[PDB]
């Protein structure tokens, strides 16, 4: 082992937040085998990348320019302000002009110069029409001039990458736990399940005994299923009831061998279904967890009416249960089912997984996948085949085959969900894990978020940290020296702030009070940090194109309400930046932020859905990245206050909410009457957007301290970590021009945007349902695969015409008109004072 290679792994360990070489919690070599197995797809991906295009990371799209962006263009003309030094020359450009074509027309008014966005590491390069660049469309939407600054293309050198018919049986020896309470007198038994895709194939149980520090049986549990019949990805799921503890063991190993021998397995406890329950990983807490000793000792045309029945089944929502009758119909006419890509999940749920002959015919059916291979890619459908309900390698691989076709743009929309879907994988090395490795290594933006996404899990999931660490390691070994330096700097900043937060909060404390002593203790520690020492600059984890510089220590403070996070402000590292404005980041500690990260991601999905449906509901996507254990970073949105603070501006610590105050605030903050009309329209659209989005996700009923607004009328939600559908209070309606059933032209405008936006999401029901199911399974702890998931269906009005749905949503608007300020008042009494 090279002393420099040893140093390189020590670097990687700190970048990951876990040692992949650490063997304290294994019973096989699956992790090491995956570490080995991933060398090839990494090497194949580093070898195939354009060093130049990788260095500049052009962020683009194939999707058409939306209607709301074409109308903003005046006469097939786009203005680009190209900067040199003091000088800046404006240029009229056609939307279809490629970056080379634009450079030459400027060179007219030696040829190794590139166009770069002012204030960021964003390059308008490669052969793409200017309209198809994501920064360009972003500017068009929200109104800023397109400022470029002609410079030298980055040096790719900096990106250099370091050089048998027997029945199956198990003997439950006993269960051991170091300590327990005294007591009380309780019963205890072991349940052994043979699972595959959450489907219980076979089940046996031990004789119940009293719950003491040690319990033993030494009883064999003979199962009906034969050894030859065990499918790959099948699990032995061992559970203890009084459900208190669980643990899993893959029956078929990674080398396709049956599991055999003595097994002491440290179990996970339940804190009273979810992705944590499927884990092959063992509880690393050997001195405090419940254990289990086990023993294993044993190589792999339709008639008219039925066609109607088949098609009716196929038509149902993914949360619709299949009867034996549906399963027998789907299976018998499997070659007719195959002619419906949308029938694949329901068909694959009708497979006799615990019967080799069927699994083989499934593989026979799958070999001729003409329909599936030719089918127009469906993320929703593709993802249904990647959840908990599918344990088969081949079924999961066909979903990954369709994802191969997804462009960087879309991979960036569903990246988190795709990283979460690795929790539903039977084995560490999988088609999906390799897909994420390939994409990450291929593009710099995808690679950055993959790093953070994987790091959020490694830091706070004992159940999948081991698996995720091997994927991060594999990625880190191929991103390049430059990215490894960026990642070191970001990690340095995070670890140093963590310490500052772990010291500042070690002298207070939560509840009433912000203290001048604490703000003083804060600024002191940052003054000590900046010299010396911390990184000079760093890429903002939620906005990698941005580079943060020195701290504005005086602008930094400690925030107001109840779990004490840092309001940091940084100078920008790019001196070619347009504005002198700071980079504001909230460094929060004490809370897991993965759920907030998830909510915001699904919102970003909804904007892209609305984009495809030609709509723009002006949602405000602000950065929010979970950066380690119970720690993270939130983007500070400029000129924005909470709704509640607008109520305490006129009024105070009540309670007594006034109708006129929001419209009052907006005119006070709008410089011109022209700007106030723009702010009133931006409000109407953004209010509508959050009314539908929050309603669909079932999180509409929030306090106004959790709803924020920009001085430009942009409404947005924060802090996601009597009842109403959403928040459409009298203060919002007053901005629209109404007061207690007094319909206005802007409230009429509003209702229509709402209904257009609602029907637009309804056209993507199955996608939203699958995204919502995956979120509850991988995001939050234990949730019901039946009522909890079922809300989304009801909210989306599944099985209704557009007119009934149009009505449904208008009724919801009226429940908000009926309750007015009531719900907000009740929130104010519960949250503010018990
Ligand atoms: C400086 C001073 C006077 O305290 C201000 C008084 C008013 N507050 C409002 C406030 C009060 C509380 C706030 N809390 C959060 C926040 C949070 F604290 C925890 C999780 C989160 N998820 C999403 C946002 C978020 N995020 C805020 N943002 C600031 C604006 O940009 C988006 C993120 C946030 N803002 C801002 C600071």
By DSSP bridging, strand 78-83 and strand 146-149 are parallel
Q: How many other C-beta atoms can be found within 10 angstroms of the C-beta atom of residue 267?
A: 22
Q: Is the CB of 637 under 6 A from ligand 1?
A: yes
Residues in CB range of 272: below 8 A, 6 or more apart: 782
Q: Tokens for 820?
A: 């007015």
Q: Is 625 annotated as a binding residue?
A: yes
**Partner residues linked to 566 by β-bridges:** 558, 587
Peptide bond into 102 cis (omega under 30): no
Task: Work out the angle between the directed axes of helices 481-504 and 3-16 (0-180°, nearest 10).
Answer: 50
Task: Report how far residue 395's alpha carbon sits from residue 388's, in angstroms, rounded to the nearest whole number.
Answer: 12
Pocket test for ligand 1, best of 592, 718, 721 (most atoms within 8 A of CB): 718
Please, are residues 71 and 139 in contact by the beta-carbon 8 Å criterion?
no
Residue 591 Cβ < 6 Å to ligand 1 = no
By the 8 A CB rule, do 693 and 609 touch?
no
Give the number of other Cβ atoms within 10 Å of residue 814's Cβ: 13
User: For residue 629, which of 144, 16, 184, 155 has the smallest C-alpha distance?
Assistant: 16
Give the Cα separation of 829 and 604 in Å (integer): 33
CB 114 within 8 A of CB 153: yes
Contacts for 221 with CB less than 8 Å, ≥ 6 apart: 169, 170, 171, 172, 192, 204, 205, 206
Q: Closest by alpha carbon to 364, among 323, 329, 331, 391?
A: 331
Nearest Cα residue to 77 out of 92, 62, 58, 97: 92
622 lines ligand 1 (CB under 6 A): yes
Rounded Cα–Cα distance for residues 495 and 491 (Å): 6
CB 492 within 8 A of CB 532: no
Phi, psi of 19 (to 5 degrees): -95, 115
C-alpha to C-alpha distance for 85 and 286, rounded to whole angstroms: 63
Coil vs helix vs strand at 133: strand
Domains defined along the chain, listed by start: 1-163 (3.10.20.90), 164-298 (2.60.40.150), 299-480 (1.25.40.70), 481-638 (3.30.1010.10), 639-825 (1.10.1070.11)
Which residues have a Cβ under 8 Å from the Cβ of 243 and sit 6 or more positions away?
A: 270
Beta strands (DSSP E) in 335-466 are none
Residue 227 is classified by DSSP as G
| Ligand 1 centroid, distance to 127 Cα (angstroms) | 41
Specify whether the CB–CB gap between 400 and 435 falls below 8 A.
Answer: yes
As a 3-state breakdown, the chain gives helix, strand, coil percent values, each rounded to 5, of 45, 15, 40
Enumerate the β-bridge partners of residue 226: 167
Q: Are 586 and 554 in contact (CB under 8 A)?
A: no
The region that residue 17 occupies, defined by phi over 0 for left and psi between -120 and 50 for alpha, beta otherwise, is: left
Query: Is the CB–ligand 1 distance for residue 114 below 6 Å?
Result: no
Distance, CA of 667 to CA of 672 (rounded, Å): 8
Tokens of 832: 């503010």
Closest CA to 424 of 703, 777, 730, 826: 777
- CA-closest candidate to residue 522, choices 557, 570, 564: 557
Q: Which residues pair with 204 in a beta bridge?
A: 192
CB of 124 closer than 8 Å to CB of 148: yes
Nearest-angstrom CA–CA distance, 307 and 238: 42
Cβ(755)–Cβ(810) below 8 Å: yes
Q: How far away, in angstroms, is 639 Cα from ligand 1 center?
A: 12
Sign of the dihedral defined by the CA atoms of residues 681, 682, 684, 689, in that order:
positive
- Which approach determined this entry? X-ray
Residue nearest to atom 25 of ligand 1 (CA): 719
587 is annotated as contributing to ligand binding: yes
Nearest Cα to 478, choosing from 49, 59, 154?
49
Burial (CB count within 10 angstroms: exposed 0-12, middle 13-18, buried 19+), residue 630: middle
Question: What are the structure tokens assigned to 587, written together?
Answer: 């460094």
588 is in an annotated binding site: yes
Give the C-alpha separation, 257 to 518, whole Å.
60
CA of residue 235 to ligand 1 center, whole Å: 45
Report the alpha-carbon distance of residue 399 to residue 404 in Å, rounded: 9
Contacts of 718 (CB under 8 A, 6+ apart): 642, 706, 707, 708
CA of 620 to the centre of ligand 1 (A): 14
- What is the full DSSP assignment across 10-26? HHHHHHHTS-TT--TT-
Return d(Cα 814, Cα 7) in angstroms, integer: 64
- Ligand 1 center to residue 149 CA distance, Å? 33
Q: H-helix or E-strand containing 588?
A: strand 583-589
- Closest ligand 1 atom to residue 622 Cα is 32
126: left (phi over 0), alpha (psi -120 to 50) or beta: left
Residue with tokens 């015919």: 361
Q: Greatest CA span in the chain, whole angstroms?
A: 90
Tokens 């002491």 belong to 264
Q: Is 319 annotated as a binding residue?
A: no
Using CA atoms of 272, 277, 281, 286 in order, give the dihedral in degrees to the nearest 10.
Answer: 20
The β-bridge partners of 241 are 189
ω into 305 cis (within 30 of 0): no
Residue 547 CA to residue 570 CA, distance in Å, equals 10
Residue 729, CB-side half-sphere exposure with 13 Å CA sphere: 24
Q: Which residues pair with 214 in a beta bridge?
A: 176
Q: Of 508, 506, 504, whose CA–CA distance to 524 is shortest?
A: 504
- Distance CA(770)–CA(762), nearest Å, equals 13
From 719, 721, 831, mutation site for ligand 1 pocket: most ligand atoms within 8 A of C-beta: 719
Instruction: Give the single-character DSSP code of 208.
Output: P
Ligand 1 binding pocket includes 717 (Cβ within 6 Å)? no
Strand (E) positions, 706-784? 707-710, 715-717
Nearest CA to ligand 1 atom 21: 719
* Strand 640-642, strand 624-628: pairing: unpaired
| Peptide bond just before 620 cis, omega within 30 deg | no
Do the annotations mark residue 96 as ligand-binding?
no
| Ligand 1 proximity of 825 Cβ (cutoff 6 Å) | no
Cα–Cα nearest to 822, from 702, 729, 693, 720: 729
**Which residues lie closer than 8 Å to 281 by C-beta, 6 or more apart?**
25, 462, 463, 464, 466, 467
634 in contact with ligand 1, CB cutoff 6 A: yes
Q: How far is the CA of 146 from the centre of ligand 1 (A)?
A: 29
Following CA atoms 72, 77, 78, 83 in sequence, which dihedral angle do they give, to the nearest 10 degrees?
-150
CA dihedral 351, 352, 358, 359 (to 10 degrees): 70
Task: Report the C-alpha gap between 53 and 715 in whole angstroms.
Answer: 37
SS3 652: coil
∠ CA(415), CA(51), CA(60), 5° rounding? 45
Query: Are 198 and 223 within 8 A, CB to CB?
Result: no
CA of 339 relative to ligand 1 center, distance in Å: 51
CA of 414 to the centre of ligand 1 (A): 26
Contact 827, 703 (CB under 8 A): yes
Resolution, angstroms, 1 dp: 2.7
| Cis peptide leading into residue 184 (ω within 30°) | yes
In sequence order, what are the beta bridge partners of 707?
717
Distances 253 to 108, 201, 525 between C-alpha atoms, Å: 66, 18, 51
Q: Which residues contact 280 (CB under 8 A, 6 or more apart)?
A: 30, 235, 248, 249, 250, 426
Query: Would the CB of 477 count as within 6 Å of ligand 1?
Result: no
Q: 694: CA distance to ligand 1 center in Å? A: 19
Q: How far is the CA of 707 from the centre of ligand 1 (A)?
A: 10
| Ligand 1 atom showing the smallest separation from residue 642 Cα | 9
Residue 794 and residue 773: Cα distance in Å, rounded? 14
The number of the ligand 1 atom at minimal distance from the alpha carbon of 721 is: 20
> Could you give the CA distance from residue 251 to residue 241 in angstroms, rounded to a whole number?
23
Ligand 1: residue of 568, 634, 643, 704 to mutate (most ligand atoms within 8 A of CB) is 634
Nearest to 511 by CA among 568, 560, 567, 566: 560
CA 731, 734, 735, 736 torsion-angle sign: positive
| Contacts with 176 (C-beta within 8 Å, 6 or more apart), sequence order | 213, 214, 290, 291, 292, 293
Is the Cβ atom of 97 under 6 angstroms away from ligand 1?
Answer: no
Query: What secondary structure does DSSP assign to 473-499, as a single string?
Result: HHHHTTS-HHHHHHHHHHHHHHHHHHH
- Spatial strand order of the sheet with 707-710 comes to 640-642, 707-710, 715-717
Burial bucket for residue 171 (CB in 10 Å: 0-12, 13-18, 19+) = middle
- Round to whole Å and give the CA distance between 196 and 543: 40
The closest residue, in CA terms, to atom 7 on ligand 1 is 641
Give backbone dihedrals phi and psi of 429, rounded to 5 degrees, phi first: -80, 120
DSSP secondary structure letters along 541-575: TTEEEEEEEEE-TTT-EE-SSSS--EEEEEEES-T
Residue 287 in contact with residue 49, Cβ under 8 Å?
no
CA dist 32 and 23 (Å) reads 10
- 589 a known binding residue? yes
Tell me the C-alpha distance between 787 and 348, whole Å. 24
Distance CA 27, CA 286 (A): 13
What CA–CA distance (Å, rounded) separates 337 from 98?
45
For tokens 């001196």, name the residue. 575
How many A from CA of 585 to the centre of ligand 1? 10
- Spatial separation of the C-alpha atoms in residues 422 and 472, rounded to whole Å: 13
- The gap from C-alpha 429 to its chain's centroid, in whole angstroms, comes to 21
**Ligand 1 pocket, 560 CB below 6 A?**
yes
Token digits for 351?
């497979």
Of all protein residues, the one whose alpha carbon is nearest to atom 11 of ligand 1 is 642
- Ligand 1 centroid to Cα of residue 830, in Å, is 20
Strand, coil or helix: what is 252?
Answer: strand
648 lines ligand 1 (CB under 6 A): no
Tokens matching residue 597 = 């990260």
Go through 780-790 and write b for each residue having 16 or more CB atoms within 10 A of its CB, e for each that does not.
Answer: eeebebeebbe
Which residues, in sequence order, are bridge partners of residue 825? none
Is 100 labelled a binding residue?
Answer: no
């Amino acid at each position: 082992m090279s002393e420099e290679s040893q140093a390189f792994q020590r670097q990687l360990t700190a970048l990951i937040g876990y040692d992949v070489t650490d063997v304290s919690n294994v019973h096989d070599d699956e992790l090491e085998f995956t570490r080995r197995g991933l060398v090839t797809p990494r090497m194949a991906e580093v070898a195939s990348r354009d060093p130049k295009l990788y260095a500049m990371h052009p962020w683009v799209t194939s999707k058409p320019l939306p209607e709301y962006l074409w109308k903003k263009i005046a006469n097939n003309c786009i203005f680009i302000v190209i900067h040199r030094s003091t000088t800046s020359q404006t240029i009229k450009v056609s939307p279809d002009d490629t970056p080379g074509a634009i450079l030459q027309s400027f060179f007219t008014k030696e040829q190794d110069f590139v166009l770069r966005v002012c204030g960021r590491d964003e390059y308008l390069v490669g052969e793409t029409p200017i309209k198809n660049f994501q920064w360009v469309r972003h500017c068009l939407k929200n109104g800023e001039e397109i400022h470029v600054v002609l410079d030298t293309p980055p040096d790719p050198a900096l990106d250099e990458v370091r050089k048998c018919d027997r029945k199956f049986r198990v003997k439950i020896r006993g269960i051991d736990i170091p300590v327990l309470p005294r007591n009380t007198d309780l019963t205890v038994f072991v349940e052994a399940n043979i699972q595959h895709g959450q489907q219980v194939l076979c089940q046996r149980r031990t004789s119940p005994k009293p719950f003491t520090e040690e319990v033993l049986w030494n009883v064999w549990l003979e199962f009906s299923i034969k050894i030859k019949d065990l499918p790959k990805g099948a699990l032995l799921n061992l559970q203890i009831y009084c459900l208190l503890y669980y643990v899993n063991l893959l029956l078929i190993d990674h080398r396709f061998l049956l599991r055999r021998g003595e097994y002491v397995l440290h179990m996970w406890q339940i804190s009273g279904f979810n992705a944590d329950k499927l884990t092959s990983a063992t509880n690393p807490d050997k001195e405090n967890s419940m254990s289990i000793s086990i023993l294993l000792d044993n190589h792999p045309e339709m008639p008219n009416q039925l066609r109607k029945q088949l098609e009716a089944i196929i038509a149902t929502d993914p949360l619709n249960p299949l009867t034996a009758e549906d399963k027998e119909l789907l299976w018998h006419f499997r070659y007719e089912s195959l002619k419906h890509p949308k029938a694949y999940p329901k068909l694959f749920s009708s497979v006799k997984w615990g019967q080799q002959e069927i699994v083989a015919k499934t593989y026979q059916l799958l070999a001729r996948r003409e329909v599936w291979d030719q089918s127009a890619l469906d993320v929703g459908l593709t993802m249904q085949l990647l959840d908990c309900n599918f344990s088969d390698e081949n079924v999961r691989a066909i979903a990954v085959q369709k994802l191969e076709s997804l462009e960087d743009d879309d991979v960036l929309h569903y990246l988190l969900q795709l990283v979460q879907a690795v929790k539903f994988e039977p084995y560490h090395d999988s088609a999906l894990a390799r897909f994420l490795l390939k994409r990450g290594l291929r593009n710099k933006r995808i690679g950055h978020f993959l790093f953070w996404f994987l790091r959020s899990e490694i830091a706070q999931s004992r159940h999948y940290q081991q698996r995720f660490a091997v994927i991060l390691e594999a990625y880190l070994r191929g991103c390049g020296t430059a990215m490894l330096h960026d990642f070191t700097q970001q990690v340095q900043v995070i670890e140093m702030l963590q310490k500052v937060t772990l010291d500042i909060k070690s002298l207070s404390a939560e509840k009433y009070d912000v203290s001048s002593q604490v703000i003083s203790q804060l600024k002191q520690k940052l003054e000590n940090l900046q010299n010396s020492q911390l990184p000079e600059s760093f890429r903002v984890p939620y906005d990698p194109g941005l580079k943060a510089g020195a701290l504005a220590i005086e602008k930094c403070t400690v925030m107001a309400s109840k779990k004490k996070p840092l309001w940091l402000e940084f100078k920008c590292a790019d001196p070619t930046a347009l504005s002198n404005e700071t980079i504001g980041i909230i460094f929060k500690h004490g809370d897991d932020l993965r759920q907030d990260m998830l909510i915001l991601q699904i919102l970003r999905i909804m904007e892209s859905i609305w984009e495809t449906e030609s709509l723009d509901l002006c949602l405000l996507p602000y950065g929010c990245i979970s950066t380690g254990d119970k720690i993270g970073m939130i983007e500070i949105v400029k000129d924005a206050t909470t709704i509640a603070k607008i109520q305490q501006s006129t009024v105070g610590n009540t309670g007594a909410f006034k109708d006129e105050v929001l419209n009052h605030w907006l005119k006070e903050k709008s410089p011109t009457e022209e700007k106030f009309q723009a702010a009133v329209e931006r409000f109407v659209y953004s209010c509508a957007g959050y009314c539908v989005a929050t309603f669909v996700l079932g999180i509409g009923d929030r306090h106004n301290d959790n709803i924020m607004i920009t001085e430009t009328g942009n409404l947005f939600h924060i802090d996601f970590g009597e009842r109403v559908p959403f928040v459409l209070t009298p203060d919002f309606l007053f901005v629209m021009g109404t007061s207690g059933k007094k319909t206005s032209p802007h409230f009429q405008k509003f209702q229509d945007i709402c209904v257009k936006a609602y029907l637009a999401l309804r056209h993507h029901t199955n996608l939203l349902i699958i995204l919502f199911s995956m979120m509850l399974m991988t995001g939050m702890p234990q949730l019901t695969s039946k009522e909890d998931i079922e809300y989304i269906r009801d909210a989306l009005t599944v099985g209704k015409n557009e007119e009934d749905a149009k009505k449904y949503f208008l009724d919801q608007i009226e429940v908000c008109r009926d309750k007015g300020w009531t719900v907000q008042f009740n929130w104010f009494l519960h949250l503010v004072l018990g």
